[PDB]
């Protein structure tokens, strides 16, 4: 090869690019061994919400597929409501703390656009203060007439028992 | 992960071992060979020792693991238990 080259490593393998990056290898220095490089983990870890059964093996359905199952297969088959696509698609918004990722609403919008019929006025947005509006909603709810008609006083706990449920439209089902 | 350490078994140490073994004159190629043999030996022992440690679901290799390894390898060692 030297005679051919005279007559005429790590940069080939992807595992060095996967662990360490395009820079050369670690010479076992002080501030070089103690480094963690992130390439695929940026887009592999927040992808489990949409493809759970393949990336992490949780045997459930994706977020897009759950939203499509509810919008297209259960809500038109439920009696007592008027419009299943014309009402529930007016405001689909995103609440929780595990939501403030870059380009999260757009992925759900493209998935629902792939599932829903053409012409549905889909408008996906998000809340204003996603980690703090869960407190502010119960703050604004706390001293109204429906809340006053849904409290459990001390003598009601002494009489009705422990598992007593004032059936409010936000709480769980009564038992 | 440190560097080498096979050279930790220095020349005068191997010479000492040969002296206790009753060797008058030692060749130059004896030392590397001895390092190899000791490496193979320690590998064979530590493998089984770590195996015993793993079966006990422990993260610390005890002396009794070494004793069991040596005993099942055919070199019983007194003065540590068993």
């Amino acid at each position: 090869x030297x005679x051919x080259x005279x007559x005429x490593d790590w940069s080939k393998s992807l595992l060095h690019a996967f662990r360490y990056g395009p820079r050369p290898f670690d010479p076992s220095s002080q501030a070089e061994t103690h480094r963690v490089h992130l390439n695929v983990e940026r887009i592999r870890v927040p992808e489990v919400l949409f493809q759970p059964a393949a990336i992490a093996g949780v045997d459930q359905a994706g977020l897009v597929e759950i939203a499509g199952d509810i919008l297209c297969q259960r809500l038109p088959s439920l009696p007592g409501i008027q419009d299943a696509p014309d009402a529930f698609l007016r405001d689909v918004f995103l609440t929780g703390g595990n939501t403030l990722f870059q380009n999260f609403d757009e992925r759900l919008r493209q998935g629902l656009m792939a599932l829903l019929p053409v012409g549905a006025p889909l408008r996906v947005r998000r809340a204003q203060d996603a980690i703090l509006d869960a407190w502010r909603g119960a703050a604004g709810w706390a001293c109204t007439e429906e809340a006053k008609a849904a409290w459990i006083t001390r003598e009601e706990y002494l009489e009705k028992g422990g598992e007593y449920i004032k059936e409010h439209d936000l709480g769980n089902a009564f038992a | 992960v440190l560097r080498d350490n096979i050279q930790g078994i220095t020349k005068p140490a191997i010479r000492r071992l040969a002296r206790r073994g009753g060797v008058k004159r030692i060749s130059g190629l004896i030392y590397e060979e001895t390092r190899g043999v000791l490496k193979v030996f320690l590998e064979n022992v530590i493998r089984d020792a770590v195996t015993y440690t793993e079966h006990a679901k422990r993260k610390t290799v005890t002396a009794m693991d070494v004793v069991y390894a040596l005993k099942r390898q055919g070199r019983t060692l007194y003065g540590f238990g068993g």
């Binding site: 489990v48 595990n98 409290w151 | -």
Partner: protein, 278 residues
């Protein structure tokens, strides 16, 4: 060939943001003085029982006063001869005997000896020297035994006029001034999808996905444990992986095209995000 790393720029590196303590002990007593000045029926203490961060405050404000994890820790020192027990954010994550009120992976409270001390820290740092109504959050389709035990701790331990349970995502719906929609809320413990029809939750058909931010942190910890394979000289906590996920992860738009050409050499220097250690 020296070209692919000769003109390559020096790296821009980010340190580790581990969830440490913070130097604050306020005994805030300026809230009770404002709470006793309002007319009755319009004063209540609201506690968001979050799995990652229990929040608590008074209803007539906009920001919550206390925002702590459910971490507690108790000790006994024989070199001093004294029993310690502090909770909340006052734990440093040097000693750790940490056990959490929530079960790991599910937002159902089943560690009541921790939840009692967490509520104790809440009522101390709000200021209770003596009886206000309590509005408190829970998880969707909560188990009855947990609600029974929580109500027993509220009435019997502390003594309260009234409390009422609600779903926090639906409260954030009602604050966001919606009427009928499809609330999708990805929490720290599970991701709920709840259809709401005219300010009423249709909880007979809501579906929770069993994935969350804690699962993000644990799966990120597993992949950094298996990526750096030969042994990484560093303490790989779960919380520092959570802070990696918080600021270094984004959902890609078109995944199968972005993924297959991601580890190409041309341009990996701008995709890669690098983390030091001390």
């Amino acid at each position: 060939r020296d070209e692919p790393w000769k003109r390559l720029p020096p790296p821009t590196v980010y340190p580790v943001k581990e969830a440490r303590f913070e130097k604050y002990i306020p005994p805030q007593l300026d809230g009770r003085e404002r709470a006793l000045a309002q007319p009755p029926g319009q004063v209540a203490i609201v506690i968001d029982n979050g799995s990652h961060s229990v929040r608590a405050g008074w209803n007539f404000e906009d920001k919550p006063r206390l925002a702590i994890p459910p971490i507690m820790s108790k000790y006994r020192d024989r070199k001093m001869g004294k029993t310690f027990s502090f909770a909340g954010s006052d734990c440093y994550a040097a000693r750790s005997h940490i056990r959490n009120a929530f079960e790991a992976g599910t937002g159902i409270v089943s560690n009541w000896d921790v939840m009692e001390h967490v509520l104790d820290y809440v009522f101390v740092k709000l200021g209770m020297n003596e009886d206000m109504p309590i509005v408190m959050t829970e998880a969707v389709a909560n188990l009855p035994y947990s609600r029974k035990s929580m109500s027993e701790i509220i009435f019997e331990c502390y003594g309260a006029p009234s409390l009422v349970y609600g779903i926090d995502s639906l409260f954030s719906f009602r604050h966001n001034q919606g009427q009928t929609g499809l609330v999708v809320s990805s929490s720290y413990s599970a991701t709920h999808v709840i259809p709401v029809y005219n300010r009423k939750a249709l909880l007979s058909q809501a579906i929770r996905l069993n994935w969350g931010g804690w699962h993000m942190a644990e799966y990120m910890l597993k992949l950094l444990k298996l990526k750096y394979y030969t042994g990484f000289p560093g303490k790989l906590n779960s919380s520092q992986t959570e802070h990696m996920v918080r600021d270094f992860c984004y959902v890609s738009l078109d995944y199968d095209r972005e993924l297959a050409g991601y580890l190409d050499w041309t341009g990996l220097e701008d995709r890669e995000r690098i983390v030091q250690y001390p």
